[PDB]
Amino acid sequence: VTLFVALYDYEARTEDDLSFHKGEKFQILNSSEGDWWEARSLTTGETGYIPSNYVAPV
């Protein structure tokens, strides 16, 4: 299981990443260090590349 939370908001400036507000949960599927993690939003259902440092394990 992987239920992280956005410690801060995020205005996806591109369609590649996602957008949300500090407090939104996310399901990390592919991290592997780096910088851009692919988490699926449990609200919309689609996934995107959100900032790995913008989310933490709950």
Structure report:
The chain is mainly β and 58 residues long. The chain has one domain: SH3 type barrels. 0% of the residues lie in helices and 41% in strands. It has a five-stranded antiparallel β-sheet with strand order 4-3-2-1-5, with no helix packed on it. The chain is globular, with a radius of gyration of 10 Å.
Query: What's the CATH H-level superfamily name?
Result: SH3 Domains
Count the beta strands: 5
Report the principal-axis shape.
Answer: globular
Give the N-terminus to C-terminus distance in angstroms: 11 Å
**H/E topology pattern:** EEEEE
Helical content, roughly? under 10%
Protein name: Tyrosine-protein kinase Fyn
Family: Belongs to the protein kinase superfamily. Tyr protein kinase family. SRC subfamily.
Domain SH3: 1-58
Subcellular location: Cytoplasm; Nucleus; Cell membrane; Perikaryon
Provide a quick synopsis of the model.
With 58 residues, this protein is mainly beta. It is built from no helices and five strands.
Give the key terms.
5 strands, 58 residues, monomer, globular, mainly beta, 0% helix, SH3 type barrels, 5-stranded antiparallel sheet, Tyrosine-protein kinase Fyn
How are the SSEs placed, and which strands pair?
Elements: E1 3-6, E2 25-30, E3 36-41, E4 47-51, E5 55-57
Antiparallel strand pairs: 1-2, 1-5, 2-3, 3-4
